[PDB]
Write a protein that binds this DNA or RNA. Structure first.
Length: 98
DNA sequence: CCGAAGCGAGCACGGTGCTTTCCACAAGATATATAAAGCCAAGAAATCGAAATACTTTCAAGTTACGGTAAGCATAT
């Protein structure tokens, strides 16, 4: 993903809405190397996490209400700290980076 | 019948320090036969060493799911 003349380091999504989302109907969540052969300027390593953090549905999002602190408590009560410990390996999509 | 000229010639040259073709017939050669004994000697049958075309495992190579901080931009005070 470095020293490559064919990659693009942009911030927005120019044509990504069509180049990257078609794979949702084309390929599964495996063998991402088939995607980079058709989408120029994008590498599979960043594309995986982009697809993940963009097309996920089950996330703790919204405004901080009077019922979310209990959610945080029961989240940090499942196995422990969760952010950086090994217990993050079994947390479903609850990665530490978020 | 002697005379001249070749001409062949015995005579000398110092002291020492054998092969094969036949009658001779008198022996030889090739002939069994036990019979114990070990070995040499060539033809099959059993056995084992070298190894190649294959199977396990080791080992290099890149692409894989999963972060570690760090920087540019939106919006509340």
């Amino acid at each position: 993903k470095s020293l490559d003349p064919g990659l693009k380091k942009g911030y927005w999504a120019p044509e990504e809405d069509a180049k990257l989302l078609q794979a949702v109907a084309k390929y599964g969540e495996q063998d991402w190397f088939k995607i980079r052969e058709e989408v120029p300027g994008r590498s599979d390593a960043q594309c995986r996490d982009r697809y993940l953090r963009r097309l996920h549905f089950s996330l703790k999002k919204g405004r901080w209400n009077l019922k979310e602190e209990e959610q945080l408590i029961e989240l940090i009560e499942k196995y422990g700290v969760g952010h950086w410990a090994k217990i993050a390996s079994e947390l479903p999509h609850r990665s530490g980076s978020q």
